[PDB]
Amino acid sequence: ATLKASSLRALKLMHLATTDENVIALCHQAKTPVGNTDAIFIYPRFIPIARKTLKEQGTPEIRICTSTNFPHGNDDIDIALAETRAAIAYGADSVAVVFPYRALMAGNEQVGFDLVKACKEACAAANVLLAVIIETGELKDEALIRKASEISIKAGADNIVTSTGKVAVGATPESARIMMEVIRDMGVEKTVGFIPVGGVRTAEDAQKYLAIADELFGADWADARHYAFGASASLLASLLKALGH
Numbered sequence: 001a002t003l004k005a006s007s008l009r010a011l012k013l014m015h016l017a018t019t020d021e022n023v024i025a026l027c028h029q030a031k032t033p034v035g036n037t038d039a040i041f042i043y044p045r046f047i048p049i050a051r052k053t054l055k056e057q058g059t060p061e062i063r064i065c066t067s068t069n070f071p072h073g074n075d076d077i078d079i080a081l082a083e084t085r086a087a088i089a090y091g092a093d094s095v096a097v098v099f100p101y102r103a104l105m106a107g108n109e110q111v112g113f114d115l116v117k118a119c120k121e122a123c124a125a126a127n128v129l130l131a132v133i134i135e136t137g138e139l140k141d142e143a144l145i146r147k148a149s150e151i152s153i154k155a156g157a158d159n160i161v162t163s164t165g166k167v168a169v170g171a172t173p174e175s176a177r178i179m180m181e182v183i184r185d186m187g188v189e190k191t192v193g194f195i196p197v198g199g200v201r202t203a204e205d206a207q208k209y210l211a212i213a214d215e216l217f218g219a220d221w222a223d224a225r226h227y228a229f230g231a232s233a234s235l236l237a238s239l240l241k242a243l244g245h
Contacts (some may be wrong), residue, residue: 007242010206039063047090063093071166073098094129116155131159137169149182161195170198197230203242
């Protein structure tokens with residue numbers, strides 16, 4: 001019941017991930033006997049069918065998140081932006097664009113800034129939030145992790161995100177802490193949230209991830225707008241099991 005209280009908390013912070021059939025089932029999985037995940041995360045094309053299914057089962061407040069420049073994080077701005085504009089036209093509540101991390105690793109900090117800033121202008125124009133996935137498991141270095149997060153934040157990111165879930169290494173407690181300390185060190189905790197993708201597998205993992213946030217900013221900071229678990233139904237069935245379900 002410290003574990004049950006934080007399990008419930010984490011369940012409601014979930015951005016539940018994973019065909020028309022799979023996405024429909026996903027929406028039904030997001031609606032649980034103890035409450036609803038905050039959102040789902042799906043490919044842009046599935047947004048209209050998801051919106052409808054979520055509307056039908058009585059859960060229109062469950063948000064729909066999606067990804068662009070994904071999963072590779074290439075450095076073509078116009079492609080990243082056209083993808084982001086389509087995501088919006090589909091009805092996304094937020095878009096996770098992949099930061100051009102290879103470009104930053106080959107010494108180019110400016111293309112990450114321009115790219116994030118172009119997708120942010122599109123999203124803000126439509127009242128859509130922009131998340132930025134820096135892909136910590138590829139950047140690897142603490143210094144590059146800070147750097148990608150700071151550029152993202154200056155370019156207007158609303159949320160910074162560890163990972164795509166598509167490479168070998170997702171979130172670790174250490175990359176999570178580095179990224180949140182950038183939010184702290186720039187003093188932008190009102191305007192910027194955080195999302196670990198990968199690395200959270202169990203109810204006990206989630207509890208530990210939130211405790212980093214609570215210790216950094218206080219226990220009120222991590223609210224639906226400022227913290228999400230970018231995760232699948234294994235985390236969810238863990239969280240629910242921890243609740244007697």
